[PDB]
Symmetry: C2
Subunit: 180 residues, 2 copies
């Protein structure tokens, strides 16, 4: 519907970039993912930054059972991150974990960028990634991660610290969720 | 996006009806509208049950300035509710006031039902009201309320207490917001 909340969240996100506080966030860990999430949803979602205690789904696809989150989250964390493919593989798992009640996609995309920034010196130019193509690649990722790999690989940038490049990407990241 | 939060809110709405707690929500008042909202969004929205202190919009349409909410809310609450037309006019004002950050549509639709129940012993068969027709009528409502008045008048029921009917109704209400 109107998604008024998300308008406010987008502003928190922008604030996160503009203030330089994003450099302060721990990278590649679930703590770091929680930090991102808290920043984006604090004051909006009661569970901002909190691991869910309920099960969630898209269609007939259940995300990781909250029963196992304590086990699988550290296991994802421990995955290697030495190249592009490994990092995308780690991202695909973290998305399957989908550890929050809402806002997994936009928090985890930032998380991914930080991981690519740290290890590869790259980020994803989300605004060059069409929404339908992104969603369909994500939907296929649990079974075949080739689509999402190819799609992210086509659109890396070395322009890793430029505030407006980053803000354009976050704007698109929120557009993926329906905010136009 | 996935709207996991909304699925969780749907279960809370169902529970509100099924448990019979709905029978002691105060009818036709701001406090009552807040009770509804609190109940649907508690533990989901940080702001569950609270009047917003920010401005919100759809397109270039701003809902009532949060600067005036303290003044217009009591004025809306004072509006007559003796017949169908009055109750709908009251509802239309209440939607324009849009006093919460998010979840105005679902809370206020329930609020409408309770008013119609108290006053005319009817409820709206939401599941028989197409979503495009509903959205178009609401969009036109600030300027001309005939569309919404006509649409609602055609899908009223005397069966105000059947919880199957009520659940079908609330499921459709959530569907209006994009929950599928
Ligand atoms: Zn709204
Ligand atoms: Zn999701």
């Amino acid at each position: 519907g109107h998604m008024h909340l998300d308008r406010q969240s987008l502003e928190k996100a922008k604030h996160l970039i503009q203030s330089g506080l994003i450099d302060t966030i721990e990278v590649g860990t679930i703590k770091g993912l929680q930090e991102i999430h808290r920043f984006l949803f604090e004051g909006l979602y009661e569970f901002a930054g909190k691991i869910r205690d309920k099960n969630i789904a898209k269609g007939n696809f259940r995300f990781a059972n909250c029963l196992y989150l304590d086990l699988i989250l550290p296991r994802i964390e421990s995955m290697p991150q030495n190249n592009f493919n490994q990092i995308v593989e780690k991202y695909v798992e973290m998305n399957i974990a989908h550890p929050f009640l809402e806002g997994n996609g936009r928090a985890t995309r930032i998380w991914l960028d930080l991981l690519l920034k740290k290890e590869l010196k790259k980020i994803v130019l989300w605004d060059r990634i069409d929404k339908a193509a992104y969603l369909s690649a994500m939907e296929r990722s649990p079974v075949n991660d080739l689509e999402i790999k190819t799609l992210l690989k086509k659109h890396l940038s070395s322009n890793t610290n430029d505030p407006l490049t980053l803000i354009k990407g976050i704007t698109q990241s929120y557009y993926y969720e329906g905010l136009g």
